[PDB]
Amino acid sequence: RGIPSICSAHPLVIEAAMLRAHREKAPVLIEATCNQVNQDGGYTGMTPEDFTRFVGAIADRIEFPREKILLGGDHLGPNPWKHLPADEAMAKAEAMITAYAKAGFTKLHLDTSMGCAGEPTALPDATTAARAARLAAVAEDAVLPVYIIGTELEVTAPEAAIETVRVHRAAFEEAGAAGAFSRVVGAVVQPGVEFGNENVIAYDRARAEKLSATLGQLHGMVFEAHSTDYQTPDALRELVADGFAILKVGPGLTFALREALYGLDQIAAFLFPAARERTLAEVTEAVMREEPANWAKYYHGSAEEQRLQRHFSYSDRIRYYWPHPKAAAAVDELMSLLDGVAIPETLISQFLAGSYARVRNGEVAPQAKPLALAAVDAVLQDYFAAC
């Protein structure tokens, strides 16, 4: 066994993640990031409490037990306030860690490695660790939790993996956090998986053996791996076997959701060309073009290269726009225009080819929301298969 980590904010991805877990029949790990959700609202307007009830609302809609929902916190620390001076940056890391803890979150990733201006971008290991430890000890005071430590063509040097845990260990005792340190169940390490706009680098089992073996010196500890997105089911299975046992996927999950919605967009534009002022893709493009902040740093080059990538790239920045009012309303126009409508298999074969076999076998209903979950679930299947 290992556990799949779902860091998506998207209601349908969560619903879909839950539905698969129910099959499986085991629990579902859902994660949020420092930036995404904190006392101040993050960029979503969601405090850790907001998130906790948001996810609960979904569970109910589909009779899924809260008992089985596991809530993570990803990259917790000074990051969302790193433009500020360190003592203040860490102050907010502190208020935030409590809000999580007091909100049920039971996986806590403590990433304190970034400089707070102005300090060198990557902090020296003792400082990194002494700050990780402070947050550990504020966590405990406010309260069950487990902890993950560490940060992310690169692969992690096996030496540094152990050193990180040496130095955190020391700093946790100096702290008198030692009791939390025993509940540190993993570290973030770069096992050698990247993905670009239009290409994936697969997990090389050879290149990460020296890293994988370090896991013998680390007792009661596995590796968390980030950016397993788009990896082949095979790669996914090897990662788990070799002890990268916590697999974070996010972008891959909303990437697939997008394809389904865009398929559904084209089915709707064909069946019902009249019923729509504008296309879901037309609106998505317009909104992205109007409010570039969330894609601007990611897609570069000619205007035509930027267009392709606004919709198609594996970085999947489009995922930050699913909440923009003009875009959430286009989705609902499209979802509701296909409500009750039994899509013909033949359109499904053209436009949502990945649900075709499943539609033939009776597994998936040929209706738009089931076809959207069906897309998500295809990614999700591979993660649980590796677990």
Comma- or semicolon-separated keywords:
387 residues, alpha/beta, TIM Barrel, GI Alpha 1, domain 2-like, 2 domains, 8-stranded parallel β-barrel, two-stranded antiparallel ribbon, 10 strands, 48% helix, globular, transferase, PSI-Biology, New York Structural Genomics Research Consortium, nysgrc, monomeric
Please provide a written account of the structure.
The chain has 387 residues and is α/β, with parallel strands linked by helices. The protein has two domains: 1-250, Aldolase class I (TIM Barrel, Alpha-Beta Barrel); 251-387, Orthogonal Bundle (GI Alpha 1, domain 2-like). Helix content is 48%, strand content 12%. The protein contains 16 helices and ten strands. The chain has helices at residues 11-23, 48-61, 86-101, 125-141, 158-175, 178-181, 210-213, 233-241, 251-271, 280-290, 293-296, 303-312, 325-337, 345-351, 356-360, 368-385; strands spanning 3-6, 28-33, 69-76, 107-110, 146-150, 184-188, 194-195, 200-201, 222-225, 244-249. β9, α8 and β10 (244-249) form a beta-alpha-beta unit. The radius of gyration is 22 Å and the shape is globular. The relative contact order is 0.11.
Pattern of helices and strands: EHEHEHEHEHHEEEHEHEHHHHHHHH
**Helix/sheet category:** alpha/beta
**Helix content percent band:** 40-55%
The number of helical elements comes to: 16
Q: Could you describe the largest sheet, including whether it forms a barrel?
A: 8 strands, parallel, barrel
End-to-end separation in angstroms reads 5 Å
- What's the CATH H-level homologous superfamily of the largest domain? Aldolase class I
Q: Quick one: overall form?
A: globular
* CATH class category of the largest domain: Alpha Beta
* DSSP E strands, number: 10
Which CATH architecture of the largest domain would you pick? Alpha-Beta Barrel
In percent, how much strand structure appears in the residues? Answer: 5-15%
State the domain count.
2
Give the neighbour order of strands across the main sheet: 1-2-3-4-5-6-9-10
Tell me the radius of gyration. 22 Å
CATH topology of the largest domain: TIM Barrel
PDB class: transferase
Keywords: Structural Genomics, PSI-Biology, New York Structural Genomics Research Consortium, nysgrc, transferase
Assembly: monomeric
Entry title: Crystal structure of a probable tagatose 6 phosphate kinase from Sinorhizobium meliloti 1021
